[PDB]
Structures are given as C-alpha cells and as structure tokens.
Amino acid sequence: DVNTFLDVVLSRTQRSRIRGFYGRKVKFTQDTITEKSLYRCKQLKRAALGRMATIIKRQHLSRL
Structure with missing residues (x-):
C-alpha cells in the first residue's frame, strides 16, 4: 500500500553541519x-x- 511504501521508505531512510x-x-x-x-x-x-x-495520501492486468 501507499502507507506501507511510505513506512518502507522511512525504514529505508533510517537504514550548521548537523x-x-x-x-x-x-x-x-x-x-x-x-x-x-x-x-x-x-x-x-x-x-x-x-x-x-x-x-x-493523494489487478486487471493480473486477471488477463
């Protein structure tokens, strides 16, 4: 999902000058x-x- 992808992106990001x-x-x-x-x-x-x-926040191919 989009929220899951955002969480995965946030997890990937986690994995003056400051x-x-x-x-x-x-x-x-x-x-x-x-x-x-x-x-x-x-x-x-x-x-x-x-x-x-x-x-x-802002299937057919598989069934073919």
Whole structure:
C-alpha cells in the first residue's frame, strides 16, 4: 500500500553541519519515496516529511 511504501521508505531512510545533514536526510528520504539549530532543522525535516505524507495520501492486468 501507499502507507506501507511510505513506512518502507522511512525504514529505508533510517537504514550548521548537523542542520544541513538533517535537511539532506529529509531530502534523501523524499528522494527514495519519490523514486518508489537542531530543533529548527528537525522541524524543517518534519515539515518535509509531512508534505511527503500529504502527497502520499493523494489487478486487471493480473486477471488477463
């Protein structure tokens, strides 16, 4: 499912400089999903995840 794929993408992603890394990690998570201050950086990364989650929410060949 789409939610399962997003969870798999999140699992795949899990498997100054820190602020840039957090944005890169969010971008890397978004790239994998698309292909298929620390608190401020985490909030920006969470916002990217939230935007991806909204996009994520938005048989015949086998039986032939």
